[PDB]
PDB file of N, CA and C and ligand atoms in Angstrom:
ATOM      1  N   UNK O   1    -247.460 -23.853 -92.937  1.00  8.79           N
ATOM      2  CA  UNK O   1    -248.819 -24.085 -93.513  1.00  8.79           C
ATOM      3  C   UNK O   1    -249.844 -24.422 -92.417  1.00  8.79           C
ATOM      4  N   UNK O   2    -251.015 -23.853 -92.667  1.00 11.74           N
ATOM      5  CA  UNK O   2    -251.866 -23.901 -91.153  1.00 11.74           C
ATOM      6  C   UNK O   2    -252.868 -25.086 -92.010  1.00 11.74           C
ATOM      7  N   UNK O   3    -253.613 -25.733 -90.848  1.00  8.08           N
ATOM      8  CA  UNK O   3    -253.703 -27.086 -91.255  1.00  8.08           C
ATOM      9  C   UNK O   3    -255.351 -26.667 -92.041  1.00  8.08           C
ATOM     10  N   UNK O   4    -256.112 -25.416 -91.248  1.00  4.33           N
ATOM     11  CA  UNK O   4    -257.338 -25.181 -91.606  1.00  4.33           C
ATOM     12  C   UNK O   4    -257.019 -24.292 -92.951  1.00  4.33           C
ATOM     13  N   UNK O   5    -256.079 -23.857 -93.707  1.00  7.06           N
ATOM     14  CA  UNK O   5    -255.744 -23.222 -95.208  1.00  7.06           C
ATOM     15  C   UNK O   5    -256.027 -24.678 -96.034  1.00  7.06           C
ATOM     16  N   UNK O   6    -255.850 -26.079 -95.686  1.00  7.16           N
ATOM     17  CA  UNK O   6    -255.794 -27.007 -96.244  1.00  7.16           C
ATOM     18  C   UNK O   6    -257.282 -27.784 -96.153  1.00  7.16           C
ATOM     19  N   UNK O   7    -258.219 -27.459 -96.333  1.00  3.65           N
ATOM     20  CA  UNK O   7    -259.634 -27.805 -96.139  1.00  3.65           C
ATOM     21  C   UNK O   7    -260.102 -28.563 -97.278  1.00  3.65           C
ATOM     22  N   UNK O   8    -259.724 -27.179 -98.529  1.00  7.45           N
ATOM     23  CA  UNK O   8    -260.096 -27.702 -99.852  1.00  7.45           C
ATOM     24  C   UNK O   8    -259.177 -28.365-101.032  1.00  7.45           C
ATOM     25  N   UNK O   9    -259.368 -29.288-101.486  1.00  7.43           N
ATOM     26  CA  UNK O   9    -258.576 -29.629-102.750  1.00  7.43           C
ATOM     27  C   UNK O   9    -258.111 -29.105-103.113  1.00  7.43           C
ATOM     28  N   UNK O  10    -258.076 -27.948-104.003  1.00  9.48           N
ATOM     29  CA  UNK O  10    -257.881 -26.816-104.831  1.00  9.48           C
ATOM     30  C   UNK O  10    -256.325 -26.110-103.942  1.00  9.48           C
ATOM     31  N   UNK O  11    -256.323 -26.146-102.780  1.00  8.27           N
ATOM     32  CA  UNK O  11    -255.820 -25.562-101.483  1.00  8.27           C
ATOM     33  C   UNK O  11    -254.387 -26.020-101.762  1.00  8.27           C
ATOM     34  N   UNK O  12    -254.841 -27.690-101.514  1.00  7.46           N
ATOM     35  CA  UNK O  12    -253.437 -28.672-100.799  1.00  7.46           C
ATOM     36  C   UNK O  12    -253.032 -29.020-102.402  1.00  7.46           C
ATOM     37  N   UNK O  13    -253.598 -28.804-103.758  1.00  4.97           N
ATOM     38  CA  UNK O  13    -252.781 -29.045-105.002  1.00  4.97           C
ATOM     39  C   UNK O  13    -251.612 -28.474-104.816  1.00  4.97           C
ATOM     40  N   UNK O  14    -252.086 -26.543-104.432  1.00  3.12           N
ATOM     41  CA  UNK O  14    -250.745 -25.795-104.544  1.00  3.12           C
ATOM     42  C   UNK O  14    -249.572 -26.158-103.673  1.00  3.12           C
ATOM     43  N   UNK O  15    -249.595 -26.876-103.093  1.00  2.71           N
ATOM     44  CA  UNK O  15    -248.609 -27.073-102.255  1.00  2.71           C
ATOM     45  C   UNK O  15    -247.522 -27.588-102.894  1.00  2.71           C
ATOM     46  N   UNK O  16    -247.623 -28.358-103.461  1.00  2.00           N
ATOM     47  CA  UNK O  16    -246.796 -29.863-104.229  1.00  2.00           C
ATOM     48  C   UNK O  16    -246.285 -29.056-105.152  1.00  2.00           C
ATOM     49  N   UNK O  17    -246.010 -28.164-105.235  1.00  2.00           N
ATOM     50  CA  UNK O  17    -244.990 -26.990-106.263  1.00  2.00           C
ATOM     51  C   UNK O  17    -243.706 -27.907-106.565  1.00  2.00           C
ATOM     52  N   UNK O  18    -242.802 -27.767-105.212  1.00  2.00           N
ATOM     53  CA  UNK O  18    -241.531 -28.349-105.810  1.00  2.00           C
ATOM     54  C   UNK O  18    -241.194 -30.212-105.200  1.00  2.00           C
ATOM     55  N   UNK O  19    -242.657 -31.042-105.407  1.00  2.00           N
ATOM     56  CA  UNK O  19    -242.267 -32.132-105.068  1.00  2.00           C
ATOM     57  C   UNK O  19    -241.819 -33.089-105.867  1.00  2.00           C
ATOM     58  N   UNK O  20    -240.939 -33.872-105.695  1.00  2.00           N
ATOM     59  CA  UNK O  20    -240.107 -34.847-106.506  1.00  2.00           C
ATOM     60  C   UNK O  20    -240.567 -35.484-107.739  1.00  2.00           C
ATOM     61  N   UNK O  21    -240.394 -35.461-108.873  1.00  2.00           N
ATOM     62  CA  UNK O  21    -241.147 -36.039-109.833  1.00  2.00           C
ATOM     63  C   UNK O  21    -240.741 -37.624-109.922  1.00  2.00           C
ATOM     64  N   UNK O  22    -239.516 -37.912-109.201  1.00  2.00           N
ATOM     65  CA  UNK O  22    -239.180 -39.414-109.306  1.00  2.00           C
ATOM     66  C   UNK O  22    -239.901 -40.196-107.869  1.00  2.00           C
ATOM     67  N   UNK O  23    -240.586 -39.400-106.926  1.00  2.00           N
ATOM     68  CA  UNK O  23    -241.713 -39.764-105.954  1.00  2.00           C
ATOM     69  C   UNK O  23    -242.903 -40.332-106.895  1.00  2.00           C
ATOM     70  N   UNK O  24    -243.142 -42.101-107.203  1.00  2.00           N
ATOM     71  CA  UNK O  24    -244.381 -42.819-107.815  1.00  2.00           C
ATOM     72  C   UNK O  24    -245.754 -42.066-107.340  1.00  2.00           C
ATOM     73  N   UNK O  25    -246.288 -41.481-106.641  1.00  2.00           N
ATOM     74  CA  UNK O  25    -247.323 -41.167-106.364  1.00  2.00           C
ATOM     75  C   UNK O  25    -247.422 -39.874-106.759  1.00  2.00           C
ATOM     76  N   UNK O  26    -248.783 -39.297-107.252  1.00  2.00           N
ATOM     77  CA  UNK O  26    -248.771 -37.952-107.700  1.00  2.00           C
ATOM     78  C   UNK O  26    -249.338 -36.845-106.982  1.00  2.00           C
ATOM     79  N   UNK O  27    -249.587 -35.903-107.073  1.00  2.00           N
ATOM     80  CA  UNK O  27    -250.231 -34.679-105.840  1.00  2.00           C
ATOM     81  C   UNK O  27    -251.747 -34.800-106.010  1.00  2.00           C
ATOM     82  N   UNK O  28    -252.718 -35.316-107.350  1.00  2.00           N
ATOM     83  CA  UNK O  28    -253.381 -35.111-107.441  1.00  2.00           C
ATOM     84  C   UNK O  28    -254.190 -36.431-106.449  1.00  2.00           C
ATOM     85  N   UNK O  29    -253.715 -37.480-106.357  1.00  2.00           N
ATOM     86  CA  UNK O  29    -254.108 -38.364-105.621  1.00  2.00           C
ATOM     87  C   UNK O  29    -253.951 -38.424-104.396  1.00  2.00           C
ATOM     88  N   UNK O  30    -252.378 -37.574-104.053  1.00  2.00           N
ATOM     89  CA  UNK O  30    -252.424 -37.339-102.382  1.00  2.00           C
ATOM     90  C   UNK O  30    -253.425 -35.931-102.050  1.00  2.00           C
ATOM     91  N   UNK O  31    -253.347 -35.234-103.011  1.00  2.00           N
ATOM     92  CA  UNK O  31    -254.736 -34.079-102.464  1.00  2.00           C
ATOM     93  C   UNK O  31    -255.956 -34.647-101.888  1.00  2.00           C
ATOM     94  N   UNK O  32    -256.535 -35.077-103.292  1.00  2.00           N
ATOM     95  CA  UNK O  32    -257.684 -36.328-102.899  1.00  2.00           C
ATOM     96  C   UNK O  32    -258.205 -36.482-101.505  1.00  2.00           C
ATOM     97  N   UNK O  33    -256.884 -37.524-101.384  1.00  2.00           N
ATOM     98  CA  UNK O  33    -257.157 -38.669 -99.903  1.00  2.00           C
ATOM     99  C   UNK O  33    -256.721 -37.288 -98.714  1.00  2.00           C
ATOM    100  N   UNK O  34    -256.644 -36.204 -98.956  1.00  2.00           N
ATOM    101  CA  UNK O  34    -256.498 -35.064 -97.741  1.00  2.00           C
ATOM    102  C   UNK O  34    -255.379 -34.873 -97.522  1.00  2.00           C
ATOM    103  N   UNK O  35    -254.569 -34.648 -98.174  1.00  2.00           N
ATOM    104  CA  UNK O  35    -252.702 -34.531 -97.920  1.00  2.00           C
ATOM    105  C   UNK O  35    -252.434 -33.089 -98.618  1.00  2.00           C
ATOM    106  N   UNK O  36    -251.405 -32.941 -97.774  1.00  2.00           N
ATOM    107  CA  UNK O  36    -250.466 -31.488 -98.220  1.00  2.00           C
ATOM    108  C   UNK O  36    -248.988 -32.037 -98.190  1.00  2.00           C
ATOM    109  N   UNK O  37    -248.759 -31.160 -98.962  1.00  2.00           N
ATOM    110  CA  UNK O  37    -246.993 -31.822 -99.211  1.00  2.00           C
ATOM    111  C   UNK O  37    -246.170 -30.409 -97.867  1.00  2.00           C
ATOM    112  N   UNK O  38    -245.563 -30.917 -96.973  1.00  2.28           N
ATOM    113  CA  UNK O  38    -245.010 -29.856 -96.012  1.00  2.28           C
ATOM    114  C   UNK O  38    -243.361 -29.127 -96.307  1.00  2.28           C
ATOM    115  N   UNK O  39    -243.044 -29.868 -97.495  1.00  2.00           N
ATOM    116  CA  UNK O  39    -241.955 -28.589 -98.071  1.00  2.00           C
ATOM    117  C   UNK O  39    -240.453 -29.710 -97.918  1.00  2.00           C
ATOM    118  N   UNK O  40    -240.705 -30.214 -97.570  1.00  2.15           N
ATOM    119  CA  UNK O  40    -239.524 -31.685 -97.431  1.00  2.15           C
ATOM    120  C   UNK O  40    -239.799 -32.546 -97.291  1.00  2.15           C
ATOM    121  N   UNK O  41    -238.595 -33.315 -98.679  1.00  2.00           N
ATOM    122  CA  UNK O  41    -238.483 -34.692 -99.361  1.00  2.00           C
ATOM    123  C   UNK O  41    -240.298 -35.330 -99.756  1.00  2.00           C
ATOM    124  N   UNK O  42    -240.567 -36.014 -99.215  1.00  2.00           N
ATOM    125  CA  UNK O  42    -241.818 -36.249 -99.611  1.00  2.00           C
ATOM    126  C   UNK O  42    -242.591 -36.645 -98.597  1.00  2.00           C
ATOM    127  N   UNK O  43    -242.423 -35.564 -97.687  1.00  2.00           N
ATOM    128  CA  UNK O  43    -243.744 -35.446 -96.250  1.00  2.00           C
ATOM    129  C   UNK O  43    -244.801 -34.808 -96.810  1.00  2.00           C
ATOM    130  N   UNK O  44    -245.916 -35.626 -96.387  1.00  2.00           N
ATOM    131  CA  UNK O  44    -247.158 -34.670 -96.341  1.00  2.00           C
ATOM    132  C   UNK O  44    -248.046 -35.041 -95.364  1.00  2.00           C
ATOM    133  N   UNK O  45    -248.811 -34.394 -95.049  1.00  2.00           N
ATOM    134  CA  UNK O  45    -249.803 -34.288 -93.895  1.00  2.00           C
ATOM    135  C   UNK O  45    -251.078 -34.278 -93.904  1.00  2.00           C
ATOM    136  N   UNK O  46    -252.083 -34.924 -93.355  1.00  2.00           N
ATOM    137  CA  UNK O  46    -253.788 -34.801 -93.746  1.00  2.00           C
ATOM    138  C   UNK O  46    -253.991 -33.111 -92.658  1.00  2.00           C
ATOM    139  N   UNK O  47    -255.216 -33.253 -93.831  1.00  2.00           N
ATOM    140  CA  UNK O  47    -255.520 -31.608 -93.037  1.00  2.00           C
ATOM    141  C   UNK O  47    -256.540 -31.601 -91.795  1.00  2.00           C
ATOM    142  N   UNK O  48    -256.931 -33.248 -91.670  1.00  2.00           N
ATOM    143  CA  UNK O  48    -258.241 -33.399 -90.983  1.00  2.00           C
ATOM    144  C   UNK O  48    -257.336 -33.879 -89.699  1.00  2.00           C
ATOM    145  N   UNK O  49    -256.972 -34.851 -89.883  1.00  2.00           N
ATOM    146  CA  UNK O  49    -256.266 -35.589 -88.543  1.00  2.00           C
ATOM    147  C   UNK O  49    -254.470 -35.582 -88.353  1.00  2.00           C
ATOM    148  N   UNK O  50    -254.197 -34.713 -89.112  1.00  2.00           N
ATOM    149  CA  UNK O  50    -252.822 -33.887 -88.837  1.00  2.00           C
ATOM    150  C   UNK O  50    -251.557 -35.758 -88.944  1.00  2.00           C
ATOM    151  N   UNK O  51    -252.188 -36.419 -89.504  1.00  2.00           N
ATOM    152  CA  UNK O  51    -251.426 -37.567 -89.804  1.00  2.00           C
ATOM    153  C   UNK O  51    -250.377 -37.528 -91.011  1.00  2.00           C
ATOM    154  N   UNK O  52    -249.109 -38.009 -90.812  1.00  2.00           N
ATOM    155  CA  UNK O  52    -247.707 -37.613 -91.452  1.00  2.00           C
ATOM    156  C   UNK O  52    -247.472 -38.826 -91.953  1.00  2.00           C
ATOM    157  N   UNK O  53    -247.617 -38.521 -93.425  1.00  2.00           N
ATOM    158  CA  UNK O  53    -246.697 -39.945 -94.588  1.00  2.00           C
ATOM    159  C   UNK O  53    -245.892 -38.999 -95.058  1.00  2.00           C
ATOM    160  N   UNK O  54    -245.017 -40.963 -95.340  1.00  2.00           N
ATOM    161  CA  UNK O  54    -243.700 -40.526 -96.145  1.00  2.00           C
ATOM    162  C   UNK O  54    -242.999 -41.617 -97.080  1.00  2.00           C
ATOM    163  N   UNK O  55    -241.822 -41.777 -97.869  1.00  2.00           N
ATOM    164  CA  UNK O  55    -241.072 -42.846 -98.823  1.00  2.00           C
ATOM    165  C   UNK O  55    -242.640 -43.215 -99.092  1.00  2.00           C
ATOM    166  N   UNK O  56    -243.540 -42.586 -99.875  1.00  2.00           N
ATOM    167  CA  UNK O  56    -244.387 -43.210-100.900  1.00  2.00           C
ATOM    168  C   UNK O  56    -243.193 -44.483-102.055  1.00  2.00           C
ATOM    169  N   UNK O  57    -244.312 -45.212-101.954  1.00  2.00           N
ATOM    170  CA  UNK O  57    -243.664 -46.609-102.863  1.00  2.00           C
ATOM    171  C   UNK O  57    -244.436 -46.876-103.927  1.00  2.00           C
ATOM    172  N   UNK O  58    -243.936 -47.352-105.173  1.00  2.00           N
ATOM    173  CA  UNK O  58    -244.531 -47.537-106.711  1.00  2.00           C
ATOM    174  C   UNK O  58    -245.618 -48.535-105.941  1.00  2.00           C
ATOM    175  N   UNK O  59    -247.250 -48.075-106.593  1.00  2.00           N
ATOM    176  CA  UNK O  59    -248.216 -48.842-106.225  1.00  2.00           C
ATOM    177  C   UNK O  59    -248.708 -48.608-104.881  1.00  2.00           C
ATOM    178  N   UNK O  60    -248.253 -47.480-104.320  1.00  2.00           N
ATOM    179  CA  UNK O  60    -248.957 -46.970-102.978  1.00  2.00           C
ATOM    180  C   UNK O  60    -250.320 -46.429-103.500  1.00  2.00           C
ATOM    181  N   UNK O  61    -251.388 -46.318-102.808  1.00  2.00           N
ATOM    182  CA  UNK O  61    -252.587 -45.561-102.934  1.00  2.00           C
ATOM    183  C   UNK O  61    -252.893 -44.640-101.441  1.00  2.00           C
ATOM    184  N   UNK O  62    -253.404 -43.590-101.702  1.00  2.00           N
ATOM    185  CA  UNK O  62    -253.425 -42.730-100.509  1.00  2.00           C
ATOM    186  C   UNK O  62    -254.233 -43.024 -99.752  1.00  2.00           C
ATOM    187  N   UNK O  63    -255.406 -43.002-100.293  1.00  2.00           N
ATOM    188  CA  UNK O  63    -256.743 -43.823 -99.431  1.00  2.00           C
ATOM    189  C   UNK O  63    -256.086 -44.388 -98.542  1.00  2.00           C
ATOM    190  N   UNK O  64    -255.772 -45.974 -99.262  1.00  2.00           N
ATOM    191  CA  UNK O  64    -255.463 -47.271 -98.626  1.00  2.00           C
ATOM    192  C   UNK O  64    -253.972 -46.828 -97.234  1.00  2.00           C
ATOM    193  N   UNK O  65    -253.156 -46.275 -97.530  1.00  2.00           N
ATOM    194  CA  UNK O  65    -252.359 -45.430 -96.528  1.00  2.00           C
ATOM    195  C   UNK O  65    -252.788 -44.759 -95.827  1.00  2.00           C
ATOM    196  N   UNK O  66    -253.956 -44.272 -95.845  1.00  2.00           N
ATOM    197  CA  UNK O  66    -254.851 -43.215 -94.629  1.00  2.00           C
ATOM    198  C   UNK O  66    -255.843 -43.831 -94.326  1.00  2.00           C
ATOM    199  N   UNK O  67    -255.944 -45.054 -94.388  1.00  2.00           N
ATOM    200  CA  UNK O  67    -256.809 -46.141 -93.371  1.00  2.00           C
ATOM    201  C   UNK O  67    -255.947 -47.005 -92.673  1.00  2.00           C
ATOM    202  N   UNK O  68    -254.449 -47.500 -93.372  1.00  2.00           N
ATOM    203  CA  UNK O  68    -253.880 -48.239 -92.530  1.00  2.00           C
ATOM    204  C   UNK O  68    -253.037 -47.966 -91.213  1.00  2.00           C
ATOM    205  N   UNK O  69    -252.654 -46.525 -92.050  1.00  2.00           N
ATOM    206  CA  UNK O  69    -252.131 -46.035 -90.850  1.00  2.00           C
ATOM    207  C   UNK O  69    -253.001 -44.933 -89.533  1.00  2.00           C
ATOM    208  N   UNK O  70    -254.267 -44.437 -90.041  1.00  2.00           N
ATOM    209  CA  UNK O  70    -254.646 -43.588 -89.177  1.00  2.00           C
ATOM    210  C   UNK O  70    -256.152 -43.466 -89.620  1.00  2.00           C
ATOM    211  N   UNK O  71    -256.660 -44.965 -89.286  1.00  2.00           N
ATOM    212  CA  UNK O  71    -258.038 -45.372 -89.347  1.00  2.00           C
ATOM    213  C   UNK O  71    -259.591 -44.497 -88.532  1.00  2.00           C
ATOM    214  N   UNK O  72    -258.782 -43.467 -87.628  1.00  2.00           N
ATOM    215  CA  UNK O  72    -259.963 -42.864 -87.013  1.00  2.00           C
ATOM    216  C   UNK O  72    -260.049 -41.278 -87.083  1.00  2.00           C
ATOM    217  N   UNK O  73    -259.558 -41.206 -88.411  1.00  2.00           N
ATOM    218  CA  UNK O  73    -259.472 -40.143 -89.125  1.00  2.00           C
ATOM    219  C   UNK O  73    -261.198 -39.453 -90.040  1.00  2.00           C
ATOM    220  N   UNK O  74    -261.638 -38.656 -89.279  1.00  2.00           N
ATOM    221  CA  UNK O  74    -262.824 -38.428 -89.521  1.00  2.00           C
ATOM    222  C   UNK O  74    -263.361 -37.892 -91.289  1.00  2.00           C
ATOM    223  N   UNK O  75    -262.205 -37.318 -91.837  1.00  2.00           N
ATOM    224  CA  UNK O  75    -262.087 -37.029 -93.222  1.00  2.00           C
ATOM    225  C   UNK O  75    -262.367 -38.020 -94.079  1.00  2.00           C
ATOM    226  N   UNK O  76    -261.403 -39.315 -93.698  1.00  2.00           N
ATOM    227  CA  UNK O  76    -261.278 -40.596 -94.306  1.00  2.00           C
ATOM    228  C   UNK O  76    -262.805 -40.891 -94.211  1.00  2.00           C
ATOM    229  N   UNK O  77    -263.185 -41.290 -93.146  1.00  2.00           N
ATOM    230  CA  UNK O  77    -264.342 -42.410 -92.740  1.00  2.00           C
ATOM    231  C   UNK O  77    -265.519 -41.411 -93.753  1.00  2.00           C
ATOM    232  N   UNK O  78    -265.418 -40.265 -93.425  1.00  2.00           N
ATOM    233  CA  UNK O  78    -266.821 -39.357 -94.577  1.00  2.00           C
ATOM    234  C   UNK O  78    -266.712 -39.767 -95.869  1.00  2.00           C
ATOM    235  N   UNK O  79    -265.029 -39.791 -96.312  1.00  2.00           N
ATOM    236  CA  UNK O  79    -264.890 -40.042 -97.488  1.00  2.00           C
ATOM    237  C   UNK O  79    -264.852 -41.657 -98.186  1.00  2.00           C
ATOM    238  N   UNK O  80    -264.285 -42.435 -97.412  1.00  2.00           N
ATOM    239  CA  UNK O  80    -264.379 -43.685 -98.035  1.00  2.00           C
ATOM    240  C   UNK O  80    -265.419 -44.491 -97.157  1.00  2.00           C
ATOM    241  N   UNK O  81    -265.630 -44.388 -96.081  1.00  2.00           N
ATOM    242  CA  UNK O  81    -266.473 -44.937 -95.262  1.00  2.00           C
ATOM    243  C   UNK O  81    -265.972 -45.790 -94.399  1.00  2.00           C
ATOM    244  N   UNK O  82    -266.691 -46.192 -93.313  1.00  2.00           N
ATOM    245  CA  UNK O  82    -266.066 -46.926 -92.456  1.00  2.00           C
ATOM    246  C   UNK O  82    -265.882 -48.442 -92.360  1.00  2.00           C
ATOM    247  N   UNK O  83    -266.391 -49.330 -93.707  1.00  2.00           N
ATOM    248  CA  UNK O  83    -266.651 -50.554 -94.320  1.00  2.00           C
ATOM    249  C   UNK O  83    -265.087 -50.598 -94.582  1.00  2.00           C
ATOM    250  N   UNK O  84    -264.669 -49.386 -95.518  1.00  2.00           N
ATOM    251  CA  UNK O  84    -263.522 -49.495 -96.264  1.00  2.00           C
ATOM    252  C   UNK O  84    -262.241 -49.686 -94.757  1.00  2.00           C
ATOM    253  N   UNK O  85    -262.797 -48.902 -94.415  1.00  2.00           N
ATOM    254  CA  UNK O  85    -261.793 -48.975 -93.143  1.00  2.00           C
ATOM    255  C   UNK O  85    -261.219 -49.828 -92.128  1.00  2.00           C
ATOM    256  N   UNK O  86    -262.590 -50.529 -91.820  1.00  2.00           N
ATOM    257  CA  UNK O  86    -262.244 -51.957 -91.295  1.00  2.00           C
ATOM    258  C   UNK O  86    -261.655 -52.856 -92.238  1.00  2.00           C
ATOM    259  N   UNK O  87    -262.150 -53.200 -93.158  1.00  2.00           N
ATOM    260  CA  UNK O  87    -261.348 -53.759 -94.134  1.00  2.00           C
ATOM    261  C   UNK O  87    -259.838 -53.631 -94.226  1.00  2.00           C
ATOM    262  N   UNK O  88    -259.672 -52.856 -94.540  1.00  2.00           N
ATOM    263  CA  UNK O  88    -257.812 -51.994 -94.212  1.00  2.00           C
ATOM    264  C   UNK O  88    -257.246 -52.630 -93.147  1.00  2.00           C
ATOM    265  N   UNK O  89    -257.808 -52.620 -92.146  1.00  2.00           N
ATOM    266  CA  UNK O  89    -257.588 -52.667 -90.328  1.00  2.00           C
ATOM    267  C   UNK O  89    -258.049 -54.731 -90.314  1.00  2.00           C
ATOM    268  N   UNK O  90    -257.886 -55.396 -91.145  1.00  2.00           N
ATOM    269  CA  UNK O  90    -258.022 -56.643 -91.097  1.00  2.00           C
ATOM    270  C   UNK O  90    -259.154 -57.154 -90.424  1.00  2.00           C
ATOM    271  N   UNK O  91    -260.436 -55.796 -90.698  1.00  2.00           N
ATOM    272  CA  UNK O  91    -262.086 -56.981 -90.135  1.00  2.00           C
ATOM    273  C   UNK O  91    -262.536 -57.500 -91.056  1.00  2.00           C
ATOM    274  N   UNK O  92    -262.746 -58.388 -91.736  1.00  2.00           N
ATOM    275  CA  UNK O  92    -263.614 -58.520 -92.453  1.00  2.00           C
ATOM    276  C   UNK O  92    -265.176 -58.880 -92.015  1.00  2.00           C
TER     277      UNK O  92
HETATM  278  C1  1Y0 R 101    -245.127 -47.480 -98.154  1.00  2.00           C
HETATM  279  N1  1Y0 R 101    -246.172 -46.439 -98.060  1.00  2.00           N
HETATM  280  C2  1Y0 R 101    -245.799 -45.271 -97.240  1.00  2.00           C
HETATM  281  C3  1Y0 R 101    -246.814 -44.143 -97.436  1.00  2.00           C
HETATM  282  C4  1Y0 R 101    -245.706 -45.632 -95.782  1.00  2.00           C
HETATM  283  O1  1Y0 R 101    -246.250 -46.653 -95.353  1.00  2.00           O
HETATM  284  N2  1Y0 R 101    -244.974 -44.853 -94.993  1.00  2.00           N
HETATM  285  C5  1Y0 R 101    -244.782 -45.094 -93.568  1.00  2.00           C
HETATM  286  C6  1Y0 R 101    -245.228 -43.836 -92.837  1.00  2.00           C
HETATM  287  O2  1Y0 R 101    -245.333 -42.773 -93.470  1.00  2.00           O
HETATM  288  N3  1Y0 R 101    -245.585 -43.849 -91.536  1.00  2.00           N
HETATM  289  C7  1Y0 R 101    -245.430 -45.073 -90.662  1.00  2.00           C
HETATM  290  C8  1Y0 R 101    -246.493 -45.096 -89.575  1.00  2.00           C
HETATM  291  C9  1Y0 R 101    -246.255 -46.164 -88.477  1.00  2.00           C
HETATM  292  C10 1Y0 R 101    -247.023 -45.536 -87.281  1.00  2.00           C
HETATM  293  C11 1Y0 R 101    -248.403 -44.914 -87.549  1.00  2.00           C
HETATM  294  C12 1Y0 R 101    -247.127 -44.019 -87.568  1.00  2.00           C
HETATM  295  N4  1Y0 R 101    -246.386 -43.814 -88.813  1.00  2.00           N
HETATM  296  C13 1Y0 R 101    -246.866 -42.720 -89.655  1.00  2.00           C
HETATM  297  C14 1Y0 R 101    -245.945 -42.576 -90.891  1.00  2.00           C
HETATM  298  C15 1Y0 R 101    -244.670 -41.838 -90.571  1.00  2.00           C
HETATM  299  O3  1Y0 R 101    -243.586 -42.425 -90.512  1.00  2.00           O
HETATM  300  N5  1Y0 R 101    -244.807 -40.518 -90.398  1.00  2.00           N
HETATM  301  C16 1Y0 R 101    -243.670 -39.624 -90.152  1.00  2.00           C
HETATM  302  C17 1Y0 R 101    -243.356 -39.658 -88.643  1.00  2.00           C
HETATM  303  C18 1Y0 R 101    -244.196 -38.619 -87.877  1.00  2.00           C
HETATM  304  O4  1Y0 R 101    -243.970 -37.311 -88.458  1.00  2.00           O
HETATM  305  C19 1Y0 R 101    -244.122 -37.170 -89.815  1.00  2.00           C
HETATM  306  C20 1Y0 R 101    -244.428 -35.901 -90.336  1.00  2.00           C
HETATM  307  C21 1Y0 R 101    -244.596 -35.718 -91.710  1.00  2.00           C
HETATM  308  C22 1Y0 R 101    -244.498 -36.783 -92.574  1.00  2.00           C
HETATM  309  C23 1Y0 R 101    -244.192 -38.030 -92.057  1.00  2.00           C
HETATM  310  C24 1Y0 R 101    -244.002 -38.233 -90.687  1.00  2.00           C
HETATM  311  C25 1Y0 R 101    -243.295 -45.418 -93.193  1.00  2.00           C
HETATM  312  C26 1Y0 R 101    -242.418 -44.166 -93.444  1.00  2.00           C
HETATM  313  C27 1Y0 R 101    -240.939 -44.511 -93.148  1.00  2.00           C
HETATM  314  C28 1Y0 R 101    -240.498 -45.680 -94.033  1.00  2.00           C
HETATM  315  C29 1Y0 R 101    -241.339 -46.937 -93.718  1.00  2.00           C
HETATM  316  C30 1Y0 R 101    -242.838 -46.663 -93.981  1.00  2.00           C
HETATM  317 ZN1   ZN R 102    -256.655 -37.886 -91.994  1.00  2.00          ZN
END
C-alpha cells in the first residue's frame, strides 16, 4: 500500500477488509485519526507521518495515540491542533 493512495478517508476505510472484529477499536475511528490497516494482526499506519500502531486496547482513542506517540505529525496538528497536542505530551 503506497502511503500517498492513503490521503483520503474514503481510501484508508477500504483497507480494514479483513481486520479483527475482537480488536476494541473500529476502522472508522482509526481512518479518522489517519490510519490504514497494513494487512497484519492489527498494524496500521498514518498516511501523513508513516507512524506504526498496534495491540489497540478497550478505551484506546486514535487521536489521543497519534499525539502520544508521534506528536510532530503534521496531519494530527491540522487536525486536532497543536493545544491538543501539548496537552497529550504533558504541557499544560
Ligand atoms: C495501548 N494503545 C496502543 C495503540 C499502543 O500504545 N501501542 C504501542 C505502539 O503501537 N507503539 C509504541 C511506541 C513507542 C515508541 C514510539 C514508538 N512506538 C510506536 C508503536 C509501535 O510499537 N509501532 C510498531 C513498531 C514499529 O513498526 C510498526 C509498524 C506497524 C505497526 C506498528 C509498528 C505499543 C505496541 C506494542 C505493545 C505495547 C504498546
Ligand atoms: Zn501521523
Amino acid at each position: 500500500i503506497s502511503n500517498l493512495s492513503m490521503q483520503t478517508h474514503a481510501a484508508r476505510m477500504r483497507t480494514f477488509m479483513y481486520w479483527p472484529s475482537s480488536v476494541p477499536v473500529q476502522p472508522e475511528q482509526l481512518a479518522s485519526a489517519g490510519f490504514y490497516y497494513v494487512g497484519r494482526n492489527d498494524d496500521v499506519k498514518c498516511f501523513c507521518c508513516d507512524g506504526g500502531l498496534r495491540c489497540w486496547e478497550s478505551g484506546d482513542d486514535p487521536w489521543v495515540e497519534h499525539a502520544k506517540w508521534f506528536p510532530r505529525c503534521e496531519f494530527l496538528i491540522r487536525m486536532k491542533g497543536q493545544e491538543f497536542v501539548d496537552e497529550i505530551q504533558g504541557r499544560y
